[PDB]
Structure 1
Amino acid sequence: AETNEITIGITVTTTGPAAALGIPERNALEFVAKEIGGHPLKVIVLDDGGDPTAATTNARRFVTESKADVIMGSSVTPPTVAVSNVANEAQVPHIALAPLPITPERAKWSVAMPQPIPIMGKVLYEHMKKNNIKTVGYIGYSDSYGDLWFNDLKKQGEAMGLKIVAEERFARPDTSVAGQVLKLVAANPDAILVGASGTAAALPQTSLRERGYKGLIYQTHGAASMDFIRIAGKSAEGVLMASGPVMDPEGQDDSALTKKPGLELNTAYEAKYGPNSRSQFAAHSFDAFKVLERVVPVALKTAKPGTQEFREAIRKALVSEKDIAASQGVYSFTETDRYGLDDRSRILLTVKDGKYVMVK
């Protein structure tokens, strides 16, 4: 088994609540390379509905039925963890499209495109300090994503002089967070960090304001699309939100390596879907292909697509190829840094009169 095409399996969430993340990821595939080194790319896209069991099945199908050289996904963290388990057992390179906890068992075959939590937390906690915030409450998912954030707030947050005074959790599918909001408003912190994503991110935003909270609200990069503003409406005003720089390529210097790729994606996306349809999420799948454009030609020098040797050559190329410019950042993976990002990979956003504005 050795082939002319390079086979890429993608599992993303295009049904259910997390479709707010996976649909732009799928849509961005219209604008990525169709061939690398003259080899056509065979891209198989499967929905997982956000479910780790479905993601596990899809990922294994890509290995066994499709003989994939690279697997990508998923849209949210629990199925992403599942994909990483399969990829590490099968020895297939995996580009994660949601943040996930890198452990030793996942590090060999997995890299991640979204900004790591600590890089995003740093920009949020610094703004807190600069705005005279001393006490902070947290509301987030009762799963690995909500844990990543809470654990960072506690470690980074306390170390630069923030006090956590309240912690509440909710489940992704929950339609109400009334109970949690009552306890947060009762604690009355200066600021609240919401550890959520997509549509669910807007539920604490609206409930907190409707319940009369008047402190600062901070949101994570999981919330970084126009849909958050659509859902939260006036309650989104003054929110502070971590995002990738693809949200504002126009505001970047021509010397930013992120600028040309951001403009390429946004011009394509917004030509089809309209002004200000850009998102954090479209950029991740687009950027995964930018990485492949760098690493696949290296692997082609020494190995045939469809072979374990090719999979191994991609794995080694991910670490040997430095400074891969993409829309969301400049990636330099190492054997221990599976995200490969630095300060060029984030900006801080606020919302003013219903639009995103960069906090300068």
Structure 2
Amino acid sequence: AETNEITVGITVTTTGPAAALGIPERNALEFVAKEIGGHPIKMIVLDDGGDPTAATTNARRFVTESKADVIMGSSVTPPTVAVSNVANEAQVPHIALAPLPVTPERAKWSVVMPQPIPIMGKVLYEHMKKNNIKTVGYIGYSDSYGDLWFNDLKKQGEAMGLKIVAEERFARPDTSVAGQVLKLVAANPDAILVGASGTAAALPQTALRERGYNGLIYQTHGAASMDFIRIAGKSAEGVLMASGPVMDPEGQNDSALTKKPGLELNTAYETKYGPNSRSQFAGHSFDAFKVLERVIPVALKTAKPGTQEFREAIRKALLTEKDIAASQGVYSFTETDRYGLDDRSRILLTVKNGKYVIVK
């Protein structure tokens, strides 16, 4: 059934432990295109609170009630897996805003805005090698996101000559990691890698410093916003953190494809929300619309919004529209690469005097 508007269902996490990721994603929607190819965009923006059940419910609603042309979300990995499962069963294009283990069952209908974990691990393990780190301890979520990172540390990390000497896990809502941190200190690794996101990533950060761990601490791209620094305080000093280029458009070459989109997003965002309010997360939902600005006019050549033919045409256009310039990288998807990113999609940050600083 044909419609004038293009319908985009968005489920993000604006309450609960991961609200630090979902709020900037929702807030960045004020600055995306409101019309593509003559057609107005109608967004239905829902909270899932990070819960995979809620995300399933929202994604099913997008299919059976909203009849969405495209689904986007969620903000953290477990509900993103749930969304991807629903979108693939229902045959609806899905743009993930959190990392997703992309299996054959999820690969046809899902693409992924966040940088794949091995691209981010590479830059962290290289820094470790360059700084005489041999032994490494890990603390991460007891879920698929914590697994993705531990698995990369084990495969890519060990291959580069690192030795993992401790593995601890914690749950997203935990308010204490006392026992886990005590085992990490006893192990005394050269460095610790934290596999977490948002404000929760600051919990092992502060706890390690409080218990007298003085070694280097590495954080993932899940931690890349002001919230981490606000909660970690002094304990964030000297942290090494993987991040997308949206954290430093000013530092990029004038000719870099990521520069104009990053300046555009950050200029508008930080004017509303103050200096250094840029985030990894606002980059993803802004970039999801950069992708739609490219694929929708192509799909409009074969079909109209609100039809299964339009959804299928979007899916094909994601395969043929190459080098999509965005704040976080330059995207080119294939049948088997649903992330579509390269080295232009990552930089390395540290923290000095409560500010993010590029490590060159």
Q: What TM-score does the superposition give when structure 2 sets the normalisation length?
A: 1.00
What are structure 2's unaligned runs of at least 5 residues?
none
Q: Secondary structure at the match of 1:251?
A: coil
How big is the shift at 1:11? 0.1
Measured after TM superposition, the shift of residue 263 of structure 1 is 0.4
Deviation per residue, 1:108-131 (Å, 9 max, x gap): 000000000000000000000000
Per-residue Cα deviation, 1:109-154 (whole angstroms, up to 9, x for no partner): 0000000000000000000000010000000000000000000000
Provide structure 1 residue ranges, at least 5 long, that are not aligned to the other structure.
none
Identity %: 96
For 1:146 and 1:16, the matched residues in 2 are separated by 18
Give 2:279's aligned residue: 279
SS at 1:120's partner residue? helix
**Cα distance in 1 for residues equivalent to 2:231 and 2:291:** 33
The answer to whether structure 1 residue 91 and structure 2 residue 85 are counterparts is no
Distance 1:72 1:41 in 2: 13
In the TM superposition, residue 190 of structure 1 has moved relative to its aligned partner by: 0.2
For residue 310 of structure 2, what is the aligned residue in structure 1? 310
TM-superposition CA deviations, 1:314-333 (whole Å, max 9, x none): 00000111000000000000
C-alpha distance in structure 2 between counterparts of 1:122 and 1:191, whole Å? 15
Q: Structure 2: how far apart are the matches of 1:179 and 1:294?
A: 49
- Using the alignment, how far apart are the partners of 1:22 and 1:8 within structure 2? 16
CA distance in 1, matches of 2:16, 2:340: 31
Name the CA distance, whole Å, in 2 between partners of 1:138 and 1:331. 30
1:63 and 1:268 map into 2 onto residues whose CA distance is 32
- Tell me the CA shift for residue 17 of structure 1: 1.4
Name the SS for the 2:166 alignment partner.
strand
| In structure 2, distance between residues paired with 1:347 and 1:78 | 26
Q: How much has 1:350 moved relative to structure 2?
A: 0.1
Q: Tell me the alpha carbon deviations over residues 79-133 of structure 1, each in whole angstroms, 9 at most, x when there is no partner.
A: 0000000000000000000001000000000000000000000000000000010
Q: Which residue of 2 aligns with 1:211?
A: 211
| CA-CA distance at 1:255 after TM superposition | 1.1
Task: Give CA deviations for 1:294-332 in whole Å, capped at 9, x if unaligned.
Answer: 000000011111111100000000011100000000000
Match of 1:120 in 2: 120
| 1:77 CA drift (Å) | 0.3
Listed one character per residue, the Cα deviations across residues 147-169 of structure 1 (whole Å, up to 9, x for unaligned) are 00000000000101000000000
Partner Cα distance (1:158, 1:230) in 2: 33
Quick one: distance in 1 between partners of 2:230 and 2:3? 46
Secondary structure, aligned partner of 2:153: helix
Partner of 1:247: 247
Instruction: Measure the CA separation in 2 of the matches of 1:158 and 1:300.
Output: 48
User: How far apart are 1:282 and its partner, in Å?
Assistant: 0.4
Asked whether 1:300 is paired with 2:300, we answer yes
What's the secondary structure of 2:337's corresponding residue? coil
* CA root-mean-square deviation: 0.4
Q: 1:274: how far off?
A: 0.7
Residue by residue over 1:272-300, the C-alpha shift from the partner in whole angstroms, topping out at 9 and shown as x without a partner, is 00111000000100000000000000000
C-alpha displacement of 1:18: 0.6
Tell me the alpha carbon deviations over residues 226-269 of structure 1, each in whole angstroms, 9 at most, x when there is no partner.
Answer: 11011001100000000000000000010110000000000000
1:194 Cα deviation after fit? 0.1
Mapped partners of 2:316, 2:125: distance in 1: 35
Q: Which residues of 2 match residues 37-116 of structure 1 at below 5 A?
A: 37-116=37-116
| Partners of 1:332 and 1:255 in 2: CA distance | 19
For residue 178 of structure 1, report the CA deviation from its aligned partner. 0.3
Structure 1: how far apart are the matches of 2:289 and 2:114?
14
In the alignment, the residues of structure 2 paired with residue 297 and residue 132 of structure 1 have an alpha-carbon distance, to the nearest angstrom, of 51
Q: Structure 2: how far apart are the matches of 1:266 and 1:200?
A: 24
- The 2-side partners of 1:160 and 1:278 are apart by 33
1:157-196 Cα shifts (integer Å, max 9, x gaps): 0101000000000000000000000000000000000000
Secondary structure of the 1:86 match is helix
The SS at the match of 2:266 is: helix
Residue 59 of structure 1, CA deviation: 0.4
Number of residue pairs aligned between Structure 1 and Structure 2: 360
Q: Distance in 2 between matches of 1:284 and 1:232?
A: 24
Q: Secondary structure at the match of 2:193?
A: strand
**Per-residue Cα deviation, 1:58-79 (whole angstroms, up to 9, x for no partner):** 0010111111000000000000
**1:22-33 matched pairs, under 5 angstroms:** 22-33=22-33
2:256, 2:320 → 1: CA distance?
Answer: 22
Cα distance in structure 2, aligned partners of 1:42 and 1:144: 32
Query: Partner of 1:149 in structure 2?
Result: 149
| SS of residue matched to 1:106 | coil
Alpha-carbon distance in 1 for matches of 2:317, 2:130: 41
Question: Post-superposition shift, 1:35?
Answer: 0.2
Provide the C-alpha distance between the structure 2 equivalents of 1:313 and 1:166, rounded to a whole number of angstroms.
48
Q: 1:186 maps to which residue? A: 186
SS in 2 for 1:176: coil
Instruction: Give the Cα separation in 1 of the matches to 2:6 and 2:282.
Output: 22
In structure 1, C-alpha distance between the alignment counterparts of 2:229 and 2:194, rounded to whole Å = 15
Alignment partners' CA distance in 2, 1:36 and 1:354: 40
